[PDB]
Design a protein around this ligand. Structure first.
Ligand code: HEM
Ligand SMILES: CC(C)CCC[C@@H](C)[C@H]1CC[C@H]2[C@@H]3CCC4=CC(=O)CC[C@]4(C)[C@H]3CC[C@]12C
Length: 409
């Protein structure tokens, strides 16, 4: 049996508020790479099934991710932890998010939304995003010091997703705050905010945008979605609203945490920061995503009994894929605990295990990361931290809320 504290739960948001449980994941990969993480009644983060299988090795993450015929996103959704008292209907409403759909309906909605994330569509955004990155870093730098998360990390992904959606840059703050409220609900900084109401506020905004784009269509996702046809029928209001929920959250709660944690890594590894500033290599974004693993974990539910790496998984049981563990898998990566911005091949699973749900934003994310680090290297090459990062209290999202830095060092 692995050497862990009795009752230890790898989805416990109390851990992530303080730290990433790196030695605990390392202990599972060594001792029990697929391991039954039991959960006491009422302590299941919204699930009441006694616990789940912790999946810690990259090969097993791929096998689950790539066989969605067996491992369902729809049955319990993919988020493995909510507040302990969330109502089951409030988990099930998240089946209106494409991330939580299975084929065939998943297939139809993904085919539509992917039309706006083609490699040449993303490549067409380069100059715009570059111009924004330089402005963001110049403005942060002129302030001398401050919160890197708010001044640097959040802006470029937030502008990017607002521009893609068709949100006027003037209302971009609204998306960001609603996304933070919906994903921060277990953190004391978001105390007294009902995430259901924040979802409803964003959805209401999305419906205002749908009326705006119905009269004034434009080259943007809201226009695309309200015009979409599935075999003759428009997206339902529920699916349209939750499309914007999903996109606002993916846009505002992933890339910014890779950027904060990439800069944390560069502060800890000055060797790699000098190399980055000189060469600006095209492999840096992927090492930043491996090192940052912005999504710690997503889950699936077995639709039939299934043998995985000698372990018998039962129909109806949850498997929780710890990307944070897989991205440090000693049998995959040469020196996983070395931050190496030249690492290649780099078969990390920051964007999941591949298969039907693979991140549609991955190339956008990598562009965003490269553009913002080039701008930070240009405008604040000697930045240094002032105090420790403040981590988000979440049992699946690996967030940095705030991080005080001196842009001058
Ligand atoms: C470094 C940044 C990002 C990370 C680490 C990340 C990570 C992920 C992960 C782990 C998944 C689940 C994949 C799976 O289950 O196989 C996913 C799905 C998805 N992501 Fe990303 N993401 C990032 C940025 C973005 C951005 C910027 C957007 C869009 C603007 C985006 C849009 C989506 C969408 C729509 C899905 C659902 C795809 C589906 O279910 O078919 N992501 N992402
Ligand atoms: C990487 C991206 C694709 C991830 C996107 C995950 C999104 C869809 C998830 C993450 C947290 C989820 C929210 C959790 C809080 C919550 C409680 C409810 O009672 C209503 C639904 C909401 C408001 C959920 C809606 C769907 C959200 C916003």
């Amino acid at each position: 049996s692995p050497n862990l504290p009795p009752g230890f739960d790898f989805t416990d948001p109390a851990i992530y508020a303080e730290r990433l449980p790196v030695a605990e994941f390392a202990e599972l990969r060594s001792a029990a790479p697929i391991w039954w993480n039991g959960q006491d009644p009422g302590k299941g983060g919204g699930f009441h099934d006694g616990g789940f299988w912790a999946i810690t090795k990259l090969n097993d993450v791929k096998e689950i991710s790539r066989h969605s015929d067996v491992f369902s996103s729809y049955e319990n959704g993919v988020i493995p932890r909510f507040k302990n008292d969330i109502a089951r209907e409030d988990i099930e409403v998240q089946r209106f998010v494409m991330l939580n759909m299975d084929a065939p309906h998943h297939t139809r909605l993904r085919k539509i939304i992917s039309r706006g994330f083609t490699p040449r569509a993303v490549g067409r955004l380069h100059d715009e995003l570059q111009e924004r990155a330089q402005k963001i870093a110049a403005e942060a730098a002129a302030a001398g010091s401050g919160d890197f998360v708010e001044q640097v990390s959040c802006e470029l992904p937030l502008q990017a997703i607002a521009g893609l959606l068709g949100v006027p840059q003037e209302d971009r703050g609204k998306l960001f705050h609603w996304s933070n409220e919906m994903t921060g609900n277990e953190d004391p900084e978001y105390a007294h905010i009902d995430p259901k109401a924040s979802s409803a506020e964003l959805i209401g905004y999305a419906m205002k945008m749908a009326e705006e784009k119905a009269k004034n269509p434009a080259d943007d996702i809201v226009t695309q979605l309200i015009q979409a046809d599935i075999d003759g029928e428009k997206l339902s209001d529920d699916e349209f609203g939750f499309f914007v929920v999903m996109l606002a959250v993916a846009g505002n709660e992933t890339t910014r945490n890779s950027i904060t944690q990439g800069m944390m890594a560069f502060a800890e590894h000055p060797d790699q920061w000098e190399l980055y500033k000189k060469v600006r290599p095209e492999t840096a974004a992927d090492e930043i995503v491996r090192w940052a693993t912005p999504v710690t974990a997503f889950q699936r539910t077995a639709l039939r009994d299934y043998e995985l790496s000698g372990v018998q998984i039962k129909k109806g049981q949850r498997v929780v894929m710890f990307y944070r563990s897989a991205n440090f898998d000693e049998e995959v990566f040469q020196d996983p605990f070395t931050f190496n911005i030249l690492r290649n091949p780099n078969p990390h699973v920051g964007f999941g295990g591949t298969g039907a749900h693979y991140c549609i934003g991955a190339n956008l994310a990598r562009m965003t990361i490269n553009l913002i680090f080039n701008a930070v290297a240009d405008h604040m090459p000697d930045l240094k931290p002032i105090s420790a990062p403040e981590r988000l209290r979440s049992g699946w999202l690996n967030g940095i809320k705030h991080w005080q830095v001196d842009y001058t060092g």
